[PDB]
Enzyme design. Structure first.
Site, PDB file in Angstrom:
ATOM      1  N   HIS A   2       0.769  -1.303   0.145  1.00 21.34           N
ATOM      2  CA  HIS A   2      -0.025   0.020  -0.028  1.00 21.34           C
ATOM      3  C   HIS A   2       0.670   1.458  -0.058  1.00 21.34           C
ATOM      4  O   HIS A   2       0.385   2.500  -0.532  1.00 21.34           O
ATOM      5  CB  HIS A   2      -1.305  -0.076   1.124  1.00 21.34           C
ATOM      6  CG  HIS A   2      -0.619  -0.302   2.452  1.00 21.34           C
ATOM      7  ND1 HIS A   2      -0.248   0.820   3.399  1.00 21.34           N
ATOM      8  CD2 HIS A   2      -0.564  -1.184   2.996  1.00 21.34           C
ATOM      9  CE1 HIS A   2       0.000   0.073   4.502  1.00 21.34           C
ATOM     10  NE2 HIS A   2      -0.305  -1.158   4.172  1.00 21.34           N
TER      11      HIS A   2
ATOM     12  N   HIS B  49       6.559   6.774   6.164  1.00 21.03           N
ATOM     13  CA  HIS B  49       5.867   6.243   4.750  1.00 21.03           C
ATOM     14  C   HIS B  49       5.362   7.647   4.295  1.00 21.03           C
ATOM     15  O   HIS B  49       5.160   8.523   5.040  1.00 21.03           O
ATOM     16  CB  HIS B  49       4.889   5.016   4.655  1.00 21.03           C
ATOM     17  CG  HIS B  49       3.821   5.649   5.786  1.00 21.03           C
ATOM     18  ND1 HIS B  49       3.698   5.422   6.903  1.00 21.03           N
ATOM     19  CD2 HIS B  49       2.617   6.193   5.341  1.00 21.03           C
ATOM     20  CE1 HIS B  49       2.558   5.819   7.533  1.00 21.03           C
ATOM     21  NE2 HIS B  49       2.000   6.409   6.363  1.00 21.03           N
TER      22      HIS B  49
ATOM     23  N   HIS C  86       2.031   9.249   1.036  1.00 18.91           N
ATOM     24  CA  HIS C  86       0.979   8.996   0.387  1.00 18.91           C
ATOM     25  C   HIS C  86       1.076   9.860  -0.777  1.00 18.91           C
ATOM     26  O   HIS C  86       1.630  10.951  -0.535  1.00 18.91           O
ATOM     27  CB  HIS C  86      -0.298   9.434   1.095  1.00 18.91           C
ATOM     28  CG  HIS C  86      -0.535   8.598   2.219  1.00 18.91           C
ATOM     29  ND1 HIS C  86      -1.354   7.424   2.489  1.00 18.91           N
ATOM     30  CD2 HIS C  86      -0.008   8.749   3.476  1.00 18.91           C
ATOM     31  CE1 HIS C  86      -1.224   6.891   3.728  1.00 18.91           C
ATOM     32  NE2 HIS C  86      -0.306   7.788   4.315  1.00 18.91           N
TER      33      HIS C  86
ATOM     34  N   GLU D  35      -3.172  13.642   1.961  1.00 19.62           N
ATOM     35  CA  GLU D  35      -4.276  12.993   2.845  1.00 19.62           C
ATOM     36  C   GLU D  35      -4.990  14.471   3.649  1.00 19.62           C
ATOM     37  O   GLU D  35      -6.066  14.778   3.056  1.00 19.62           O
ATOM     38  CB  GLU D  35      -3.894  12.069   3.878  1.00 19.62           C
ATOM     39  CG  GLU D  35      -3.381  10.673   3.014  1.00 19.62           C
ATOM     40  CD  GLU D  35      -3.483   9.615   3.967  1.00 19.62           C
ATOM     41  OE1 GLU D  35      -2.986   9.461   4.891  1.00 19.62           O
ATOM     42  OE2 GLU D  35      -4.247   8.871   3.403  1.00 19.62           O
TER      43      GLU D  35
ATOM     44  N   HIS E 283       4.405  10.655   6.500  1.00 21.02           N
ATOM     45  CA  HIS E 283       3.964  10.231   7.837  1.00 21.02           C
ATOM     46  C   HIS E 283       5.270   9.680   8.804  1.00 21.02           C
ATOM     47  O   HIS E 283       5.632   8.617   8.244  1.00 21.02           O
ATOM     48  CB  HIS E 283       2.931   9.420   7.927  1.00 21.02           C
ATOM     49  CG  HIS E 283       1.450  10.336   7.259  1.00 21.02           C
ATOM     50  ND1 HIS E 283       0.338   9.697   6.834  1.00 21.02           N
ATOM     51  CD2 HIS E 283       1.153  11.670   7.097  1.00 21.02           C
ATOM     52  CE1 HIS E 283      -0.502  10.431   6.630  1.00 21.02           C
ATOM     53  NE2 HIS E 283       0.099  11.524   6.602  1.00 21.02           N
TER      54      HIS E 283
END
Ligand SMILES: [Co+2]
EC number: 4.2.1.1
Length: 258
Positions: A62, A92, A94, A104, A117
């Site tokens: 993911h 990690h 996004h 996000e 994050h």
């Protein structure tokens, strides 16, 4: 089937397996800057990452996580709105398929190209697994990325991505200093929320930095070359692995600055 970011297993479906998805303290959220309350009682954050020990980088299907040794107080966060010490366990990102989306959290509805994050767990709980079952168990530092100038400190990460292209691949990743990923200013917004992927547990104190870091187009381009799938499976590029903003409900966003 298992959750992901596609049309058939995407964020709008998560509630069927993780009912907490429609909970009262879900993340991410939109940060309305005119409604955030300046709180003079919040202390400055204290980031002590000089003794950080990275160990490995992994494609978990993911995102990609860089993991750290959390067996001792080597890389910790304290201060800000936190009580106690929080140890860094992993970071990690996004990101999006295009530069106008990927973050996000949003600011006054503005979306950034990506969001980093840094995940930390409350040492009073003894281990990560116990911390996620507590309302103050984790502290996540979120940093937005905008496309502009290259970020020198991110290049070591960019360069190993070819070796963890597919789900389940990992690579030794020692001696990476996360200090190279911080903006100049530690001004932030804070609110009580949750993890942004299943199990979506509401155990997070979010610390979102006001100042974004810049990355080059070429750097973000390499992120988009990763795959969601495992080796020898049909190729699905790892892009848009971000959950849309959730209702604020009964929550206040506090600002450490005015
Ligand atoms: Co995240």
């Amino acid at each position: 089937h298992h959750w992901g970011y596609g049309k058939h297993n995407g964020p709008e479906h998560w509630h069927k397996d993780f009912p907490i998805a429609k909970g009262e303290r879900q993340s991410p959220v939109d940060i309305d800057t005119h409604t955030a309350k300046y709180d003079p009682s919040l202390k400055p954050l204290s980031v002590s990452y000089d003794q950080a020990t990275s160990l490995r980088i992994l494609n978990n299907g993911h995102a990609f996580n860089v993991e750290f040794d959390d067996s001792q107080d080597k890389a910790v966060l304290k201060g800000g709105p936190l009580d106690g010490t929080y140890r860094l366990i992993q970071f990690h990102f996004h990101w999006g398929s295009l530069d106008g989306q990927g973050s996000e959290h949003t600011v006054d509805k503005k979306k950034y190209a990506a969001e980093l994050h840094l995940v930390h767990w409350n040492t009073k709980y003894g281990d990560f697994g116990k911390a996620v079952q507590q309302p103050d168990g984790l502290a996540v530092l979120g940093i937005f990325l905008k496309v502009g100038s290259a970020k020198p400190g991110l290049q070591k990460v960019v360069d190993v991505l070819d070796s963890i292209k597919t789900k389940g691949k990992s690579a030794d990743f020692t001696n990476f200093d996360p200090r190279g990923l911080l903006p100049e200013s530690l001004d932030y917004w804070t609110y009580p929320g949750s993890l942004t992927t299943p199990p979506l547990l509401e155990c997070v104190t979010w610390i979102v930095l006001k100042e974004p870091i810049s990355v080059s187009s070429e750097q973000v381009l390499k992120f988009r070359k990763l795959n969601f799938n495992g080796e020898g499976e049909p190729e699905e590029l790892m892009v848009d692995n971000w959950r849309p903003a959730q209702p604020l409900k009964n929550r206040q966003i506090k600002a450490s600055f005015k």
